[PDB]
Amino acid sequence: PGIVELPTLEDLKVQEVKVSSSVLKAAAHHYGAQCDKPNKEFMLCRWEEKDPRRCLEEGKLVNQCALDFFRQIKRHCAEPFTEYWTCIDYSGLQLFRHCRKQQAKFDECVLDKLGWVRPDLGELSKVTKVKTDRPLPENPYHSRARPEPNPEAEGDLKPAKHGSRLFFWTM
Amino acid sequence: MWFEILPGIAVMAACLFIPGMATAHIHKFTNGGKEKRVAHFSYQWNLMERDRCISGVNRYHVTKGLENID
């Protein structure tokens, strides 16, 4: 019994970034490097509040920053990125292994056109510290008041009054 | 004098050839030239489903890059 509150359709009307999974995979490392702040803030909100109905604005801002990143890569390094993501898309598993020359062209293009460097191995998987300004959810699980603990057992022990007190056994 | 044996393998080789190419070509034909994307894990399937959604024409192989976004 209650209300399943749901934000109206207007709040979740994001611009809906539209690139295929192969295109996303091609720009994975550079996007993670130069877009880490919105992703990290949004995910910390998601993990702390534990309520996607609450951190929708961070979901907006992450999409805004992703679209800005893709607009920059469109404006500066369109051709190498296009060839690289097409060559990634050809593979069934989308492995970076086969596509290394196009990766080199894309990397040098973004390095000398947008000042970017790909993260080294394992750099993109380190736990980061975010400087979010939202408060800490006091009751993320919405837990009710806990039952009071049972009365604690304490006190000095003396011999049982009149022994066992079990039938004729006096002692 | 075993060259007479050789035709038996030859045609048989063709037989064993026919599926291996055909499947590959079929995988290229039905998926727009590119290799059939394999979903061994839920992440790959989610990527394929989002591709089907973004394509607008309900086929995952149809890919959109920079031209789709603003």
TrEMBL record, chain A:
<feature type="disulfide bond">
    <location>
        <begin position="87"/>
        <end position="99"/>
    </location>
</feature>
<feature type="compositionally biased region" description="Basic and acidic residues">
    <location>
        <begin position="145"/>
        <end position="159"/>
    </location>
</feature>
<dbReference type="GO" id="GO:0006120">
    <property type="term" value="P:mitochondrial electron transport, NADH to ubiquinone"/>
</dbReference>
<keyword id="KW-0249">Electron transport</keyword>
<feature type="region of interest" description="Disordered">
    <location>
        <begin position="132"/>
        <end position="163"/>
    </location>
</feature>
<keyword id="KW-0813">Transport</keyword>
<comment type="subunit">
    <text>Complex I is composed of 45 different subunits.</text>
</comment>
<dbReference type="GO" id="GO:0005758">
    <property type="term" value="C:mitochondrial intermembrane space"/>
</dbReference>
<keyword id="KW-1015">Disulfide bond</keyword>
<protein>
    <recommendedName>
        <fullName>NADH dehydrogenase [ubiquinone] 1 alpha subcomplex subunit 8</fullName>
    </recommendedName>
</protein>
<comment type="function">
    <text>Accessory subunit of the mitochondrial membrane respiratory chain NADH dehydrogenase (Complex I), that is believed not to be involved in catalysis. Complex I functions in the transfer of electrons from NADH to the respiratory chain. The immediate electron acceptor for the enzyme is believed to be ubiquinone.</text>
</comment>
<keyword id="KW-0496">Mitochondrion</keyword>
<keyword id="KW-0677">Repeat</keyword>
<comment type="similarity">
    <text>Belongs to the complex I NDUFA8 subunit family.</text>
</comment>
<feature type="disulfide bond">
    <location>
        <begin position="45"/>
        <end position="55"/>
    </location>
</feature>
<feature type="disulfide bond">
    <location>
        <begin position="77"/>
        <end position="109"/>
    </location>
</feature>
<keyword id="KW-0679">Respiratory chain</keyword>
UniProtKB/TrEMBL annotation, chain B:
<comment type="function">
    <text>Accessory subunit of the mitochondrial membrane respiratory chain NADH dehydrogenase (Complex I), that is believed not to be involved in catalysis. Complex I functions in the transfer of electrons from NADH to the respiratory chain. The immediate electron acceptor for the enzyme is believed to be ubiquinone.</text>
</comment>
<protein>
    <recommendedName>
        <fullName>NADH dehydrogenase [ubiquinone] 1 alpha subcomplex subunit 1</fullName>
    </recommendedName>
</protein>
<feature type="transmembrane region" description="Helical">
    <location>
        <begin position="1"/>
        <end position="18"/>
    </location>
</feature>
<comment type="similarity">
    <text>Belongs to the complex I NDUFA1 subunit family.</text>
</comment>
<comment type="subunit">
    <text>Complex I is composed of 45 different subunits.</text>
</comment>
